[PDB]
Amino acid sequence: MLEAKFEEASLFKRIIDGFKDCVQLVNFQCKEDGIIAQAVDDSRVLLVSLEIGVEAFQEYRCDHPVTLGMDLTSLSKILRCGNNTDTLTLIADNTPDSIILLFEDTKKDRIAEYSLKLMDIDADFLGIEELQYDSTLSLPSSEFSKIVRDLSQLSDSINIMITKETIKFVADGDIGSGSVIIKPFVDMEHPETSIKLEMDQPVDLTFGAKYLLDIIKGSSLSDRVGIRLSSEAPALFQFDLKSGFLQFFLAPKFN
Amino acid sequence: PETHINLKVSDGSSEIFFKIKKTTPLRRLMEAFAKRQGKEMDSLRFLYDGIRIQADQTPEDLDMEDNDIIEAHREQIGG
């Protein structure tokens, strides 16, 4: 059945914590080769998708795809009664209505195990074929974060605009405007500080800044961010993690 | 693996596939593509990831993954 063993319960807690800044519920789609954590924000605008690969786990086993719909409160509650250094194990059978977390102190032979009733969640419906993308830029994730923190102070919305050689971020407050214009560039001294642009279609979208403010927290995890926008399609922000992929899908606002 | 790399240069109309060591200056590659086009090297610009590839630089320091496309356009005043 389902048997996923994290080497450190804190690894799992870190995940759960990340999610608790944006969402209340997560769906854990367990497939044979890893888990895909999926959640939609309360206002139904943001979509987060985390891919914990298999080598992320200490021992993974999934005999059949299960979906584990969890409440992040409950889950956090259970995680308290466990030590960050214990191994954590999720245990479920082929058609669950309940899960079991199994904390294990190896150096003492303590074993603790709590149940958790699962629930039904609509982020089961994340069947995006990822679609396809007018433009695709990538940049140092903190650089992207800096920009966002600055212009989110000016306004409640930010505008991104791509052109053959220009990414232009803009915000207009009734207290001041401001704007950044960045240009694809490379350097041999610091290759990872590079800006890559692949344009096929000039794009011009606007996003709620609060969401962008969540999205940017991903930067702790990955020192680069990929952005893929398309005319009338949700924007993709994504961060490479060693054993997986964090992805946000954000709806632009219409005029 | 780490050995070489394969790259495509497309001028939108035609293509050419290239194998080079990740450490080799792209100058040659660019010239190879130009002559096979019957164009002057300086009459076209090679774009990659939105930057304007420089004859001096190599694929390695450009973050080039196997089967990357390089875009050759006429040297003009932007698209």
């Binding site: 206002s43 009338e232 | 596939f17 194998k19």
Partner: peptide, 21 residues
């Protein structure tokens, strides 16, 4: 005004080789 992420996913979806070493 902001739009819903799903009603936007709905509306949206609906021979030479030269060698140099």
């Amino acid at each position: 005004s902001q739009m819903d992420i799903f009603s936007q996913l709905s509306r949206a979806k609906k021979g030479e080789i030269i060698v140099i070493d």
